Amino acid sequence: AMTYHLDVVSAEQQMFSGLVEKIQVTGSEGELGIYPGHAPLLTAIKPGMIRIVKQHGHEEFIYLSGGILEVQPGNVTVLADTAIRGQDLDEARAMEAKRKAEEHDVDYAQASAELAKAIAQLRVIELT
């Protein structure tokens, strides 16, 4: 009892790692207060602050854009999103990627020729 190991990480970085007495975070279905001994759980969380009561009572807050909360024997891992995710938001991002590409099949022979040429130019640079 008393403490469990918590990891809070996003696809880009390690945000928190260490023993904690508990965490408070908003789950997709409700509020969550995870203490040592909590049963295995997998759920999405909502954007918002995660309240971490670190070992020795020190409180710490971290704003999360959302993500997944995974509880298993011992370790708790918050897999955080780096940005607020959702169907419409993601789609908005997809539209831009598409529009950028639409602003402006495949001649393999020409492609090879162009690469052969580029290679040739590097060789020149090499030989100074």
């Binding site: 696809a11 279905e29 993601d90 990627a97 495949v106």
Partner: protein
């Protein structure tokens, strides 16, 4: 004194790229293990099906003076695309980086989405869109394979052009999770996050490769 300065500047950037690579692992590896738990109704991303069209997320640099980093990768990708198109299998390309965009606009190719100009600071958020276009096409039966094309980082003198399969996805605990709302919804989200993660890792690794190649070119 000037080559030593040249090296200090490059080492500072390389350490940054190496930290990004290392900091990106935990999220991807934890996700992969959770997916393993849940994957053990079969989700489309977990099974093979007849291949009519294939998709590539291609990572090229945004800047020059990197020797043949892009060239060698493009060469490897074209060889694979042709073997597919020779068989009547169409290829869609999601382009990451300026060099790749200019190369394919020139030689043809179906670039359905792109993101350029991330340079030394790539991010997951800038990859959500490009990735989403390909995931959706797979969800819609418009792609039957999705690959990542990028350079694997080894050391300041060695990088390897690589094409890996992302979709479909390439003993057990005594306990099981309480799933909120249910395992199906959750598994679908984890699979999307995992693929996005792998694309992000491909990008940061390519950048590590780029910086290494440039210092060599800077010579």
């Amino acid at each position: 004194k000037i080559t030593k300065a040249m090296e200090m500047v490059a080492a500072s950037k390389m350490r940054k790229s190496q930290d990004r690579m290392a900091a990106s692992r935990p999220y991807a590896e934890t996700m992969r293990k959770v997916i393993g738990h849940l994957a053990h109704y079969k989700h489309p991303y977990l099974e093979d099906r007849d291949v009519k069209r294939v998709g590539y997320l291609v990572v090229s640099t945004d800047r020059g003076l990197c020797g043949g980093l892009n060239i060698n990768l493009f060469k490897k990708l074209l060889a694979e695309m042709k073997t597919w198109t020779d068989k009547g299998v169409q290829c869609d390309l999601a382009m990451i980086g300026s060099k790749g965009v200019s190369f394919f606009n020139s030689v043809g190719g179906n670039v359905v989405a792109q993101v350029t100009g991330m340079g030394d600071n790539p991010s997951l958020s800038e990859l959500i869109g490009p990735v989403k276009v390909m995931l959706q096409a797979y969800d819609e039966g418009r792609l039957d394979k999705l690959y990542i094309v990028s350079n694997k980082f080894i050391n300041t003198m060695s990088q390897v052009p690589t094409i890996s399969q992302l979709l479909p996805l390439p003993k057990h605990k005594s306990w099981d999770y309480l799933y909120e709302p249910d395992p199906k919804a959750l598994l679908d989200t984890l699979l999307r996050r995992y693929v996005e993660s792998q694309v992000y890792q491909g990008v940061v690794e390519n950048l590590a490769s780029e910086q290494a190649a440039r210092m060599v070119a800077m010579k």
